[PDB]
Design a protein around this ligand. Structure first.
Ligand SMILES: CCS(=O)(=O)Nc1ccccc1F
Length: 284
């Protein structure tokens, strides 16, 4: 039996190495990574790989790894796929821990925009979780944390993290992580997967995919939202992605909204993430 070496970037930034039989389905590797991580609430997570265009794709657990990575390296990242709207409802602290690590990368990367005060509050919970109670002996008037809190660090931001860290004395890691999540879950881009597209007139929009449905970001003013229940059919054809928007009460016919994606693979990727979000968050 021939085995392939897999490398997986974990959410703490470290590399897990393992081997799977070369005809393995994605679930085989995913199960190995989740066992390594002592993760039981696996449904919220997945592996990503980079395709031949260098685009992030979800590894399909049901399909052969080799038919997905094709010509590319067997290199992956472990990521949150379905961001829970109610992380308090997760059954395990270790699940909430991995969710915090993902969100910290979401913030530092700038995928999850955040006000100054929320950057400092989220940072102060991370510090409390990881160092425990504020100690002045480690931090002088000039202190700068090893922790990455933001896309752009300022001394003002560092000072505000420490001011809020002082307020969290006696807070346990599980408690600070839950507070982190209670704040993060309210951010307008929490759990939003963004896809570049053009509307039916060629105007450049973003389509966001999340628990509450499909969002269409046009021009700061008027952001159109389609709750999942209001979506009967999701389809793609060539470079185009279509949704069927239900007939309102007393309306005779469904309506159709079409989008142009960069290329055929981008249209298919958006369709698959929409179907998966619809399936996952159906009874939300
Ligand atoms: C931990 C639960 S959650 O992910 O916040 N919300 C949810 C998601 C899918 C179905 C039902 C649900 F309640």
């Amino acid at each position: 039996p021939k085995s392939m070496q897999c490398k997986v970037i974990l959410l703490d930034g470290s590399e897990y190495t393992c081997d799977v039989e070369k005809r393995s389905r994605g679930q085989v590797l995913f199960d190995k990574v989740c066992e390594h991580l002592n993760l039981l609430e696996k449904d919220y997570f997945g592996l990503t790989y980079r395709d031949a265009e260098n685009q992030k794709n979800w590894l399909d657990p049901a399909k052969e790894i080799k038919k997905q990575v094709r010509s590319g390296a067997w290199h992956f990242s472990f990521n949150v796929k379905f961001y829970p709207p109610d992380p308090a409802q997760l059954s395990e602290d270790i699940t909430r821990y991995y969710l915090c690590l993902q969100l910290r990368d979401d913030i530092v990367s700038g995928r999850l925009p955040c006000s100054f005060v929320t950057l400092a509050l989220l940072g102060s919970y991370t510090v409390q979780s990881e160092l425990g109670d504020y100690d002045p002996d480690e931090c002088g008037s000039d202190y700068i944390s090893e922790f990455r809190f933001a896309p752009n660090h300022t001394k003002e931001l560092e000072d505000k993290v420490i001011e809020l860290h002082k307020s969290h004395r006696g807070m346990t890691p599980a408690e600070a992580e839950m507070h982190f999540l209670e704040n993060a879950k309210k951010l307008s881009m929490y759990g939003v997967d963004l896809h570049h597209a053009k509307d039916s007139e060629g105007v450049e929009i973003m389509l966001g995919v999340c628990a509450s449905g499909l969002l269409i970001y046009r021009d700061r003013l008027r952001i159109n939202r389609f709750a999942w229940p209001k979506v009967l059919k999701i389809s793609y054809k060539r470079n185009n992605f279509y949704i069927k928007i239900r007939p309102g009460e007393f309306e005779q016919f469904e309506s159709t909204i079409g989008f142009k994606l960069p290329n055929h693979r981008a249209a298919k990727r958006l369709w698959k993430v929409c179907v998966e979000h619809h399936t996952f968050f159906r009874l939300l």
